[PDB]
Design a protein around this ligand. Structure first.
Ligand SMILES: Nc1nc2c(ncn2[C@@H]2O[C@H](COP(=O)(O)OP(=O)(O)OP(=O)(O)O)[C@@H](O)[C@H]2O)c(=O)[nH]1
Ligand SMILES: CN[C@@H]1CCc2c(ccc(O)c2O)[C@H]1O
Lengths: 54, 331, 284, 237
């Protein structure tokens, strides 16, 4: 009963959340990826002089 | 009558999420140039484990790592020189997870025996044994040098206290087994993926669930978390990996292929967040493009299934563990 | 004409012997899974067969075709030494493999302790040392040499290189090389066949109502190829010494070359497991 | 240079570790591991205790051969996600209550036997246990005889297939108990042999409360399992 009630309190709690459109989220993710692109040695092969595994 | 009462709320949540769907992530990311082919060559190979490997966790300095096998042994390696440092026998030979503390002082492990044990590296003897779970442990991550969070098979996750040995907070709400978790960069929130095909977002300080995502169809075996702190990716048994979003509160992209019918056992991101690495049961790994959903390479060389995966803190190398009792370092 | 045709067959055979053995050696070489305690004896066998294919066969082919030995007497002695060493080291390895299978099947609980990677190296080294002690030692020295006038003429001359031997060595080398490693293999495979038949009978008794050919075929092929290849020559060897003039040189040479072929077949017989086939598919 | 000392220290440490790893690997390869699995009310604890005379483990040695057995009790779940960890064991020991056929609930469950049959079918067809044999202990053989002989209840009432079944045999007794026992055993043999593919078999047995020879049966069955695996590996079976 209460457990049944619980699934009601939890459902009410998560119901009222302010949400932004997915366009803003996609833009933020793309901006982050483009900003920190050059600092990814895995994506861009660095010279073997700085590679510690060569 | 109460059970009936709840859905009106679920329908409202679904309607709100559908209203918030302004566009598609694929549509916005349409002019992005492809990353092209990505080739990785094995640089190091680590041997010494007598049986299959179920876990590993890169050190905080991106030099050392720990691994756990089913012969009941933890070995702390050294990636640069491929020579061991420690070998720790275990009381119980069934271990399913391991962790390595951010300060580099402690190492934890647990398994079918419902006990989480930590070890003191700078002294190798057992420091504290934590008990209270009624099922096997799936994962455990060092939140700090004094408190740790674990997820077990009794559909609960708990926050522990090393000095006292007693649970501080208990998280409840899942229906089936819990299989993985991941902590935010600031260690303020963490997510968990269960066997009822649902992922939940918790608050560590308070102890209440904030959101829930139920996009998958089968059990969830792995979960990672975006470097920015506003997204996370999951891997399930239905050969699909999805990318959710905390602010928008629904999924954005799905990664799948018609020629893949096996499962996923591990998921990890890269330093910049552009790539997504996932391990499969077809004895090989795959590399995905996060913003375009297209394969960009394959990592073959394992003779048995892959059960672990991790990327260094500085993003220089990726390590894979497999049931072939071998570890490899790619670059 | 006929000479050119024989030359063609010979050239074609040296190739197969080299290729099969080099292919077998590379795969154990290129893959971690294949290595195993049982897979070192196969490596030793492949190495011996490769050495024989490179060294023994081409020089003998040149001698047969040119009808005269151009090389020096010392090189003739060295060639005979290499021939005997390779032939006698390519059979005791088969005996060792048979014994290993016997231990693996008959004693299932004690296989792990009895065989260890450290003992395999000792066994292989002992086998090769026994092979070399009966090949170089009595041949580089002149303890096998015959006594009749034709033998003296052949030994003194630097143009001809023929094989002449006395009774003692012709019997001792044959006993060491062939006869001893045969009864062991026969006894081992008979025991293995009995065990297989017993297990098949047990399965049939347990669940026959709800639902020995493979074993017979495998044992038959394994025993038959070796016995057919190497049996006639090692009886001709003794006969041509006990009684004079019965066996001509041509028959002796032909039956000797029949034995050389067997090293080609070993990759086909001992490497039909799925792992080796997958490895072969992997490279080349 | 002059750090040339630390490296040497790491090189020494690696060898020190490797020696002990080899020494322990010998013992690890020496021993055999078994898994004990059974349904409720089967009699697992009694059998384990008689053989002796989270996870619970017992070690025994027969003829200088070390055996290691684990019974995982934890707590009940139909999802069994932890069983994928037991795919390198020698064999799986299955214990079933033979006399609990006419026990409808344990509810409105299918007779408990049917639940045991469904569990066995799930175990047999698992993807990670494709090459693991099963040792079957049909426990409680005296209560079954009591229920069959001079018994109001009948097998045909719960299992309609018993109506048109005839004995196949090794009687040791009464004519009814042999038919009942062999029908029950065939009900498992059918499932075992439906999709065996020849890589793993089943070895049914008939145990009781006062039996003392279970350990010898386990020893013999493990020896047969290893011998059959070796025979099949070399293409002789
Ligand atoms: N007659 C008979 N009864 C048995 C046998 N084994 C167990 N039992 C019965 O089982 C009851 C409890 O003993 P155990 O069988 O060890 O425990 P259990 O009830 O099987 O518990 P689980 O094995 O966990 O289901 C006793 O009252 C016994 O009567 C047997 O071989 N013969
Ligand atoms: C020249 N050919 C030799 C002559 C005698 C001989 C051979 C092989 C094995 C032996 O034990 C032998 O005694 C032949 O290969």
């Amino acid at each position: 009963i209460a457990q049944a009630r619980k699934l009601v309190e939890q459902l009410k709690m998560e119901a009222n959340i302010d949400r932004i459109k997915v366009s803003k989220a996609a833009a933020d993710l793309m901006a982050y990826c483009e900003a920190h692109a050059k600092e990814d040695p895995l994506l861009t092969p660095v010279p073997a002089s700085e590679n510690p595994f060569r | 009558q109460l059970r009936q009462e709840a859905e009106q709320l679920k329908n409202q949540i679904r309607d709100a999420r559908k209203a918030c769907a302004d566009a598609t992530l694929s549509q916005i990311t349409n002019n992005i140039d492809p990353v092209g082919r990505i080739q990785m060559r094995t640089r190091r190979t680590l041997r010494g484990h007598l049986a299959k490997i179920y876990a590993m966790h890169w050190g905080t300095d991106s030099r050392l790592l720990v691994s756990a096998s089913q012969d009941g042994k933890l070995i702390i390696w050294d990636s640069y020189t491929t020579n061991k440092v420690h070998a720790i026998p275990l009381r119980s030979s069934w271990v399913m997870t391991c962790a390595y503390a951010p300060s580099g002082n402690y190492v934890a492990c647990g398994g079918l025996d419902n006990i989480c044990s930590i070890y003191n590296l700078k002294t190798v003897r057992v420091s504290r044994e934590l008990a209270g779970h009624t099922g096997y442990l799936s994962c455990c991550r060092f939140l700090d040098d004094n408190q740790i969070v674990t997820s077990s098979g009794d559909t609960t996750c708990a926050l522990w206290d090393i000095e006292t040995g007693q649970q501080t907070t208990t998280f409840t709400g899942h229906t089936g087994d819990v299989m993985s978790l991941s902590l935010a960069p600031d260690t303020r929130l963490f997510v968990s993926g269960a066997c009822d095909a649902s992922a939940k977002l918790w608050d560590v300080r308070e102890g209440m669930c904030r959101q829930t995502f139920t996009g998958h169809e089968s059990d969830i075996n792995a979960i990672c978390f975006f470097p920015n702190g506003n997204a996370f990716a999951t891997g399930s048994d239905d050969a699909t990996c999805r990318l959710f979003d905390l602010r928008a509160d629904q999924e954005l992209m799905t990664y799948s292929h018609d020629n893949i019918i096996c499962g996923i056992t591990s998921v990890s991101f890269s330093k910049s967040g552009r790539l997504l690495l996932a391990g499969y049961d077809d004895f090989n790994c795959n590399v995905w493009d996060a913003l375009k959903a297209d394969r960009a390479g394959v990592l073959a060389g394992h003779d048995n299934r892959v059960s672990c995966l991790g990327v260094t803190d500085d993003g220089m190398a990726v390590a894979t563990g497999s049931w072939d009792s071998f570890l490899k370092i790619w670059n | 004409v006929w000479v050119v045709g024989m030359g063609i067959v010979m050239s074609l055979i040296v190739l197969a012997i080299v290729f099969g053995n080099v292919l077998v050696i590379t795969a154990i070489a290129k893959f971690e899974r294949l290595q195993t305690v049982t897979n070192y004896f196969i490596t030793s066998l492949a190495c011996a067969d490769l050495v024989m294919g490179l060294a023994v066969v081409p020089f003998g082919a040149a001698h047969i075709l040119t009808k005269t030995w151009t090389f020096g007497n010392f090189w003739c002695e060295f060639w005979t030494s290499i021939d005997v060493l390779c032939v006698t080291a390519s059979i005791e390895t088969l005996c060792v493999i048979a014994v290993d299978r016997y231990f693996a099947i008959t004693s299932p609980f004690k296989y792990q302790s009895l065989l260890t990677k450290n003992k395999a190296r000792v066994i292989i080294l002992m086998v090769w040392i026994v092979s070399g002690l009966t090949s170089f030692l009595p041949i580089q020295m002149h303890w096998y040499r015959a006594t009749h006038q034709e033998a003296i003429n052949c030994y003194a001359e630097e143009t001809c290189c023929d094989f002449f031997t006395n009774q003692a060595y012709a019997i001792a080398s044959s006993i060491v090389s062939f006869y001893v490693p045969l009864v062991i293999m026969v006894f081992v495979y008979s025991r293995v066949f009995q065990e297989a038949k017993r297990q098949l009978q047990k399965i049939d008794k347990s669940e026959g109502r709800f639902h020995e050919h493979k074993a017979l075929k495998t044992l038959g092929i394994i025993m038959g190829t070796f016995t057919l290849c190497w049996l006639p020559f090692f009886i001709v060897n003794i006969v041509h010494v006990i009684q004079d003039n019965l066996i001509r040189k041509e028959v002796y040479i032909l039956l000797n070359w029949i034995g050389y072929v067997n090293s080609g077949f070993n990759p086909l017989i001992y490497c039909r497991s799925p792992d080796f086939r997958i490895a072969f598919q992997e490279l080349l | 240079e002059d750090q040339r000392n630390e490296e040497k220290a790491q090189r020494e440490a690696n060898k020190k570790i490797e020696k002990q790893l080899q020494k322990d690997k010998q013992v690890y390869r020496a021993t055999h591991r078994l898994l004990l699995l059974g349904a409720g009310e089967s009699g697992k604890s009694t059998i384990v205790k008689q053989m002796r005379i989270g996870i619970f483990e017992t070690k025994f040695q027969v003829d200088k051969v070390n055996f290691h057995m684990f019974d995982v009790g934890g707590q009940r779940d139909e999802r069994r996600k932890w069983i994928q960890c037991f795919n390198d064991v020698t064999a799986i020991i299955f214990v079933v209550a033979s006399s609990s056929y006419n026990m409808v609930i344990r509810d409105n469950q299918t007779n408990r036997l049917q639940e045991a049959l469904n569990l066995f079918k799930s175990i047999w067809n698992n993807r990670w246990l494709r090459t693991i044999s099963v040792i079957l202990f049909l426990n409680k053989q005296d209560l079954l005889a009591e229920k069959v002989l001079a018994g109001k209840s009948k097998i045909e009432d719960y299992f309609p297939e018993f109506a048109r079944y005839t004995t196949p045999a090794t009687p040791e007794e009464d004519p009814r108990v042999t038919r009942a026992k062999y029908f029950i055993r065939d009900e498992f043999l059918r499932i075992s042999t439906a999709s065996g593919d020849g890589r793993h078999y089943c070895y049914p047995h008939f145990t009781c409360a006062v039996d003392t020879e279970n350990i010898r049966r386990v020893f013999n069955d493990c020896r047969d399992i290893i011998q059959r695996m070796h025979l099949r590996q070399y293409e002789l079976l």
